[PDB]
Design a protein around this ligand. Sequence first.
Ligand code: CL
Ligand code: CL
Ligand code: ZN
Ligand code: ZN
Ligand code: ZN
Ligand code: ZN
Ligand code: ZN
Ligand code: ZN
Ligand code: ZN
Length: 371
Amino acid sequence: KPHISALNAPQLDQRYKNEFTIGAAVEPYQLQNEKDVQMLKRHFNSIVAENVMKPISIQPEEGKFNFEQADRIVKFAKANGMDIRFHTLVWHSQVPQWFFLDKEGKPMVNETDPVKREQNKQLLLKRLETHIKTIVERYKDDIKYWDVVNAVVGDDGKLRNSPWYQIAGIDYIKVAFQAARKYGGDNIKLYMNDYNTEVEPKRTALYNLVKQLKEEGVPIDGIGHQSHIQIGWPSEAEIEKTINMFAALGLDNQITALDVSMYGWPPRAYPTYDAIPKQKFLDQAARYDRLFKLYEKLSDKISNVTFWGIADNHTWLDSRADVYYDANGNVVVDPNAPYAKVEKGKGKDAPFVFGPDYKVKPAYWAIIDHK
Ligand SMILES: [Cl-]
Ligand SMILES: [Cl-]
Ligand SMILES: [Zn+2]
Ligand SMILES: [Zn+2]
Ligand SMILES: [Zn+2]
Ligand SMILES: [Zn+2]
Ligand SMILES: [Zn+2]
Ligand SMILES: [Zn+2]
Ligand SMILES: [Zn+2]
């Protein structure tokens, strides 16, 4: 099982073509990198924007729509027969602040008068509607899958108390889905996307929320499991229990941002790829082996498995890879060991089945086989 160039290795999407599509998250600049273009053409049949389709990238100022970057990803996908997932219509992260300012330019979260709070809610929902409308009216014939809302359940099992929720209550979620369905029609598929979907109390809160919304006729077709996981956690048994319970509600499941970190939480990362011991890649390959065997076992309930990146030279996990140093200046990776300082976001994670030099990893062989 050689570390051969991925560029000519057996195609990952083809291995799984009857089980679910295989996707990658990208930045438009990658569509200008020969290696990345050949990787997308060779191994993937589904794509998503790491960042350029988020709210702040699309409408940074009210009335100013920037579709130029998103368009590049849509054109490439269409020219290569790839499905597209839209990430994401609504999120509390880096949301353009203008959405949440009242007519006088003051934060709506601050309004204490009940009648002005009601007016802000209505103004906010109107803005939400127009953002969704403009985007879905442009892409309804091109993008099949949609993360309508992202991370709306808090890790405490209560609804995340973002400005969307403080200002508009639960209706912002119902409004977002109804608007996507109204302007995109019945053929686009609508998802509620979140991370740590396997973890209690968040899992049961998500389940109850979607069950309720569907009972009320809110159009929700599936759940997106970001799946930012570790080599050990969460267990395959809990992933399975999660996929199954949402599937029992009549919902499709898509793995939307998979990455298998080499670290725990908080991560104590190595400073370079070179420093990661070979054994960690073997541990990761066994995790990937078990994980995809499970996705295959549940393939009639999962329509897509998308990795949050292409190869290990580029992954958002690096922004979380903190490097701890002892007083002698040696790197510390044991979570319980002494350390003197930490360099936040300066280390290197290695989450995919393709290495930084675009050669296949042991995890690739573990999932391209049939054992
Ligand atoms: Cl990134
Ligand atoms: Cl390497
Ligand atoms: Zn293909
Ligand atoms: Zn190096
Ligand atoms: Zn290297
Ligand atoms: Zn295998
Ligand atoms: Zn499937
Ligand atoms: Zn990136
Ligand atoms: Zn290599």
